[PDB]
Amino acid sequence: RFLKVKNWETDVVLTDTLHLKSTLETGCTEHICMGSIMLPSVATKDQLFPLAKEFLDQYYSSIKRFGSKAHMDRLEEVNKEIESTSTYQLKDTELIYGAKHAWRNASRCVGRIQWSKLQVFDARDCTTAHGMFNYICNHVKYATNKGNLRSAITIFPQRTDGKHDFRVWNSQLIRYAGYKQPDGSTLGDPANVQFTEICIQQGWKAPRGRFDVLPLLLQANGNDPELFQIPPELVLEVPIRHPKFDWFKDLGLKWYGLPAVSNMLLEIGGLEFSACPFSGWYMGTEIGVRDYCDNSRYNILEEVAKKMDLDMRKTSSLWKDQALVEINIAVLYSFQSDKVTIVDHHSATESFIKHMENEYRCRGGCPADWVWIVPPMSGSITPVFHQEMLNYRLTPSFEYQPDPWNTHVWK
Template sequence: MTALCNEMITGAPVTFAAAEDFLRMFHDAHPEAGAVRQRLAEVRAEIEETGTYRHTHQELCYGARVALRDTGWCTSGLPWRRLKVRDLRGIHKAQAVATQCFEHLRLAANGGKIQPLVTVFAPDRPEAPGPRIWNPQLVSYAGYPEMGDARNIDFTDSVEALGWQHPLPRSAFDHLPLVVSAGLQDPQLFTIPREVVTEVPLTHPDLPWFADLGLRWPAVPVISNMRLRIGGVDYPAAPFNTWFVGTDIGTRSLADESAYAMLRPVAIHLGLDTSTDRTLWRDRATLELNRAVLHSFDTARVTITDHYAETQHRLAWLRSRRNRGDRPAFRPHSSR
């Protein structure tokens, strides 16, 4: 998992070609916005004067929604046009970014009925970068050599170097602090209030001992370390969420040897023969982990989907996808 680094990014000037491609797409979808020719003339003049331009609120919302849809994060059955976009482009200080991230968690949890949400903070500008969130997700667990989320070991080491002190005693589900950098300033640590973190304790519909494993998972997957690019403008802090697919938790997080490595403990409790992979014990243990995840979220009345429904959605998305020009997208921070 990505650790903190001394990366120095300043906003590069926006090209008019990238802006034009997006604005034509926006006006095609929103003819009520007026003549595209006039808007293009305004943006060209603004870019020539400042090196960048400011999206209208409508343009920002449309771009964020298209980015979420076309990146493939839009889960099945989700009407992407109705995704809620929080336009917080006036916020660039680290403390204010952290406070609004906590509000994002509260709003997204929505009492279990997960609200798909994007929060957009200040963009990069030619003279200085915008704020950045370093955590892969707003809520994630520390990784230690002997326990926790192994994907986060490097990140945990980094935040400890910045002054974070892990709880005593340590556990497999210690919440990492939020790490935010504002412009060219050093990253700052912020403790995430417990009251804005919704977690689901994991139990199993048929296996009473499963609860004794003490597993749990955040209710909302808020991706926070990707930059949102719309028409050539980069928003380096734009946390977004939909809801979990069950296998994201059961297979990719709990079962995976590079994360929580829970397959062997579950298999031992099931009494399976783990002496050889030919017994398919890994498959059986993975199945029970995924059953537990879906059962637990359903019991807690927290929105979740399964991988069968998601497969059908992804196939439909792939059939309809069009790679045309510089489309809005969420991108890894290393991508320019």
């Protein structure tokens, strides 16, 4: 009931008691581990108050007023509001605390050493798609900060009955279109082919090219979603060059500077924020390994290896591995030379170990998903590979949610 996690490169042993405060379930049982399953698996007024009290108890505990008068009054205040409306409203402080701790609790996030430096934009007064566009544009501008990227989240009104949901239909605020071809192939980003066509459906005029920034499909108060084009001046992009290979420019690669996830659900004190786009900055491998080299994405290992004059006949020449490293040197160099914030997997994973030490010390643990914390290349030459991590679900949290077009009663 006081579990030990060991690092097998440093022999450092940490004791986890934070998992006792864990609430939701993992998918694993005593007889089957599901730690590599990608997606493991209205709310009534009765269930709502324990969730609110639990959250308020940790909130007031964190500002050194657990069990105090202001705590008990707010406890009764929220209870009374849950009796009346069968929901309640967070204080601006509680909202900022909740968001930061959702990030703090995201066991799949290697970036969490930054969890308390988070800019929270309260968009709970938003009522229309245009207001969402406006809030999102200001989020992009702020977070991007001329390349000195700043972490931020924008929080649209919480779910109520379920039929009045705020949703950003994009998976990320900024992402490249994907179109299939006549010859059945794919131009742009295969990840977003379905979404790219939904925009064409709702009325997008697609410039059927490669790195075409998709419009925003924004759903406000449950209404049908509406298209908006982010001002191109708000969309910072990095042309990808290599510090040694000058043909690398000929590759004509580029990526956007701001990773801003928009399809996830923020849960705070039993309250559900179905539109909560959050952004930080990229770890290089996200672009150079997954975005550029997944077979189901841009899949550029073919071309890079060609131009490097690599033995592509035998699988065992490791030509894929060799081209993979060159690609990630190029992403890092291009972002850094352009003064666009980026972190390499070595710096980010070292920081996560240091983050883990902090959390075990000042918090009793750090929920952590090894399958996701270890980078998609060079696993064991990073310190997280050798770090045992206990995964468990703490709240506040970021949750997955259905794509809105699979659930939305249209019109």
